[PDB]
Amino acid sequence: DDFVAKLQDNQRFRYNEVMQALNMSAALTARKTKEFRSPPQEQINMLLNFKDDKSECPCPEEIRDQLLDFHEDLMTHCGIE
Amino acid sequence: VVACFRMAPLYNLPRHRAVNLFLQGYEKSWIETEEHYFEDKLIEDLAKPGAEPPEEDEGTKRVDPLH
């Protein structure tokens, strides 16, 4: 519930930044809005890459930490310590 | 041009649709990729005759759970 709301707010803020910065270079806009032009399933799949150290996901570290803590709590509840 | 480029972003989508997409993505990205090794421990535990001679048997050695 709240994880996706925070993700959507962050995505809106990033999109606003990309609109503010698009006028600098048109070629920049192409791969900067590739994310927003991808299908929604791909968008959320590629935003859910906090695992490992690839760090290609454009997501805040605190937002990553919330999911990394929930995933540890879920493993503890599932008994996969 | 505009219609081709600007398809529905995530933030435009309603809350419940985004939640369902997050559930599917979280599943296939984290839950499936999560790996823990238990096969050797489980087989070793199942292959142990547990206190059978102390237990009342009055017969041949009872088959182990793996058996």
Give the 3-state DSSP-derived string for A5-46, with helices as H, strands as E and coil as C.
Answer: HHHHHHHHHHHHHHHHHHHHCHHHHHHHHHHHHCCHHHHHHH
Cβ–Cβ gap A45/B28 under 8 Å: yes
- Using a CB-CB cut-off of 8 Å, the residues of chain B touching A54 are none
Of B10, B15, B34, the CB nearest to A40: B10
Report how far residue A50's alpha carbon sits from residue A81's, in angstroms, rounded to the nearest whole number. Answer: 20
Specify the resolution in Å.
3.1
Cβ-Cβ contacts under 8 Å between A and B: the total is 59
Min distance A9 CA to chain B CA atoms (Å): 7
The experimental method, as deposited, was: cryo-EM
Token output for A68: 């990394």
Token output for A23: 């006028």
Report how far residue A48's alpha carbon sits from residue A56's, in angstroms, rounded to the nearest whole number. Answer: 10
Report how far residue A44's alpha carbon sits from residue A52's, in angstroms, rounded to the nearest whole number. Answer: 17
Helices (H), B27-64: 39-46
* Cα B63 to chain centroid, rounded: 29
Identity at B54, one-letter amino acid code:
P
Report how far residue A18's alpha carbon sits from residue A56's, in angstroms, rounded to the nearest whole number. Answer: 17
A64, A50 contact by CB (below 8 A):
yes
